Amino acid sequence: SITSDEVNFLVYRYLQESGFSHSAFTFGIESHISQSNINGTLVPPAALISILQKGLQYVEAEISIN
Amino acid sequence: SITSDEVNFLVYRYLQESGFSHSAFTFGIESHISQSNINGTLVPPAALISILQKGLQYVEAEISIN
């Protein structure tokens, strides 16, 4: 909540999923991903795109009560 | 709110800033990033990182209010 290694994965995903095969490959290595201790079978599809969408709304909502 | 191009640019930026130039380079070309209708001076640093943090916050904030 939320550490270095992870925002990596969250993104490494984004690349795999969005079809950025190369960028996936390269970032996979540069990120030292296969040493990165997260469980990938236990994090959602399009996990990056979403968590973002919401942080925006969290902003949007902080504007409007104020 | 919140198109591919944007989440892309956010990421590209996270790569540079954090020092993943080898990926930064590859991703930029694969995600046609020179054709970006984004003002990069109008992209604060740690942008991806901090937005992402507000997502998670908004998630906790919904779970604990239930």
Added chain:
Amino acid sequence: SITSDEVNFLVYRYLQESGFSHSAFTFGIESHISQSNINGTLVPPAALISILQKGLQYVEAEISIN
């Protein structure tokens, strides 16, 4: 006899042919390969590999004459 581009193209091919598809892609862009005055429809397969072989013989036979 023998330009930068020339060797470059020779390599680019080697990457595609040998199926080093990630690098091929990357090297393509780094070595500004699309701007080249090479006819690719004229570049025989196993281009580099076999040119190497002949070089290596030219070493060996310039040693065995003396």
Added chain:
Amino acid sequence: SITSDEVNFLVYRYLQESGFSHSAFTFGIESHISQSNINGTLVPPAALISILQKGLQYVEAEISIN
């Protein structure tokens, strides 16, 4: 005389030397270079560029004795 792995390292070199840093890296991985049985410090600078130059001269020498 002349193995798959051999021509790889040779090129991997050329990439570094040539200041093709990004393609050196990706190809470092894609060609499983850390597993390859060459002593890196037992191959001279501009190794690829030259073995090539000679292979072409050998070709020339063959045409001109006929």
